[PDB]
Design an enzyme around this catalytic site. Structure first.
Site, mmCIF file in Angstrom:
data_model
loop_
_atom_site.group_PDB
_atom_site.id
_atom_site.type_symbol
_atom_site.label_atom_id
_atom_site.label_comp_id
_atom_site.label_asym_id
_atom_site.label_seq_id
_atom_site.Cartn_x
_atom_site.Cartn_y
_atom_site.Cartn_z
ATOM 1 N N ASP A 62 7.386 4.539 1.331
ATOM 2 C CA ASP A 62 6.169 5.112 1.907
ATOM 3 C C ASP A 62 5.823 4.630 3.318
ATOM 4 O OD1 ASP A 62 4.398 7.215 1.910
ATOM 5 O OD2 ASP A 62 2.918 6.230 0.603
ATOM 6 N N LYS B 201 4.818 4.288 6.940
ATOM 7 C CA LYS B 201 4.189 5.186 7.900
ATOM 8 C C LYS B 201 2.982 4.455 8.478
ATOM 9 C CE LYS B 201 1.475 7.389 4.263
ATOM 10 N NZ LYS B 201 0.868 8.654 3.784
ATOM 11 N N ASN C 156 0.088 3.059 6.502
ATOM 12 C CA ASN C 156 0.426 1.959 5.599
ATOM 13 C C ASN C 156 0.721 0.645 6.316
ATOM 14 O OD1 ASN C 156 -0.155 3.386 3.310
ATOM 15 N ND2 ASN C 156 1.964 4.068 2.978
ATOM 16 N N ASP D 240 0.395 -0.402 0.195
ATOM 17 C CA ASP D 240 0.683 0.803 -0.579
ATOM 18 C C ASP D 240 2.102 0.914 -1.129
ATOM 19 O OD1 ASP D 240 0.520 3.131 -1.970
ATOM 20 O OD2 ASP D 240 -0.410 4.310 -0.380
ATOM 21 N N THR E 65 5.433 11.452 2.904
ATOM 22 C CA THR E 65 4.895 12.350 3.928
ATOM 23 C C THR E 65 6.018 12.919 4.789
ATOM 24 O OG1 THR E 65 2.898 10.999 4.006
ATOM 25 C CG2 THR E 65 3.319 12.452 5.864
HETATM 26 O O1 LIG Z 1 -6.463 2.988 1.916
HETATM 27 C C1 LIG Z 1 -6.193 1.791 1.766
HETATM 28 C C2 LIG Z 1 -6.855 0.820 2.521
HETATM 29 C C3 LIG Z 1 -7.822 1.202 3.459
HETATM 30 C C4 LIG Z 1 -8.484 0.242 4.221
HETATM 31 C C5 LIG Z 1 -8.181 -1.103 4.044
HETATM 32 C C6 LIG Z 1 -7.223 -1.487 3.106
HETATM 33 C C7 LIG Z 1 -6.562 -0.528 2.343
HETATM 34 C C8 LIG Z 1 -5.601 -0.926 1.416
HETATM 35 O O2 LIG Z 1 -5.334 -2.120 1.264
HETATM 36 C C9 LIG Z 1 -4.942 0.044 0.664
HETATM 37 C C10 LIG Z 1 -3.974 -0.316 -0.265
HETATM 38 O O3 LIG Z 1 -3.686 -1.642 -0.426
HETATM 39 C C11 LIG Z 1 -3.297 0.630 -1.032
HETATM 40 O O4 LIG Z 1 -2.366 0.173 -1.918
HETATM 41 C C12 LIG Z 1 -3.582 1.980 -0.878
HETATM 42 C C13 LIG Z 1 -4.550 2.345 0.061
HETATM 43 O O5 LIG Z 1 -4.887 3.652 0.264
HETATM 44 C C14 LIG Z 1 -5.227 1.396 0.835
#
Ligand SMILES: O=C1c2ccccc2C(=O)c2c(O)c(O)cc(O)c21
Length: 269
Positions: free
Chosen positions: A131, A133, A136, A153, A172
């Site tokens: 994933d 990008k 991330n 992610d 994506t």
């Molecule tokens: O969107 C976010 C996200 C947005 C703002 C700060 C941290 C994260 C974040 O740590 C995060 C993840 O760890 C994940 O595993 C899927 C995510 O979608 C996010």
């Protein structure tokens, strides 16, 4: 595996929403016993075996199992896991500085080197992220003299113990390698392609394969239809282009590996 089924609200208070994914919402939170701050990722469980909505337990458990292996400064770390009927809740390290893209070559390579160190860690463990990008790639704190990136992610990530995995693993279109577009066997090499796309965007602000529709982007990726536009890449060094060119390569066997990328003369000190 089963996770903690006590109410997460008994041990944590949740704050502002940080972000989202498909079937997941991420909220700021604070552990009541330590006062320490985390990100709580709520992943929606499948309600039935055949449902298209929600994440299958097999997929949730894979993401958790991979997270549990990871301890590195450039990768998010997992604190705890809770679950109830509706959700699995990952209590994750809080990365509060925002997305990296939210540049001089020195500044790009500074962040790129951290990405490479993180991916080198994962690939050393035979973990493909799948994933990768810009959204991330997060900054721990953007107010520090030297901001640390953290890769986030792991929802698509897989252990590659055979050197390739044959599965439909599809991220994506702008960032996926040709073998993903073509539904072919996949390995660590797909991450190295995504790194080339990230690097192209890091330097130019332009996306190399992006078309007017998703199918166009996918078609462009499979054909390796990209070029360095003079308007964007004038004054970008030839070695920077060389680095990208050796990553965006259709044949995964001919693409640079993570070790190659670290020894490439643009990266290597
Ligand atoms: O969107 C976010 C996200 C947005 C703002 C700060 C941290 C994260 C974040 O740590 C995060 C993840 O760890 C994940 O595993 C899927 C995510 O979608 C996010």
């Amino acid at each position: 595996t089963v996770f903690r089924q006590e109410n997460v609200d008994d041990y944590y208070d949740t704050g502002e929403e940080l972000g989202s994914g498909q079937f997941a919402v991420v909220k700021k939170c604070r552990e009541k016993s330590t006062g320490l701050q985390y990100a709580a990722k709520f992943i929606k469980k499948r309600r039935t075996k055949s449902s298209r909505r929600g994440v299958s337990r097999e997929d949730i458990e894979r993401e958790v199992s991979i997270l549990k292996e990871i301890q590195h400064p450039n990768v998010i770390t997992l604190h705890e896991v809770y679950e109830n009927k509706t959700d699995v809740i990952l209590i994750l390290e809080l990365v509060a500085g925002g997305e990296l893209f939210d540049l001089t070559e020195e500044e790009a390579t500074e962040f790129l080197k951290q990405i490479l160190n993180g991916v080198y860690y994962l690939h050393s463990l035979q973990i493909a992220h799948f994933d990768l990008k810009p959204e991330n790639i997060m900054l721990l704190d953007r107010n520090v003299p030297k901001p640390r990136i953290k890769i986030i992610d792991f929802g698509l990530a897989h252990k590659i113990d055979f050197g390739n995995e044959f599965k439909n693993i599809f991220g994506t279109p702008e960032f996926v390698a040709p073998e993903i577009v073509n539904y072919e066997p996949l390995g660590l090499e797909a991450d190295m392609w995504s790194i080339g796309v990230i690097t192209y965007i890091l330097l130019s602000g332009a996306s190399p394969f992006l078309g007017d529709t998703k199918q166009e982007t996918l078609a462009n990726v499979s054909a390796v239809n990209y070029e360095f536009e003079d308007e964007y890449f004038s004054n970008t060094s030839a070695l920077a282009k060389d680095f990208i060119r050796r990553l965006l390569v259709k044949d995964p066997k001919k693409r640079m590996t993570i070790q190659d990328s670290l020894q490439h003369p643009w990266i290597k000190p």
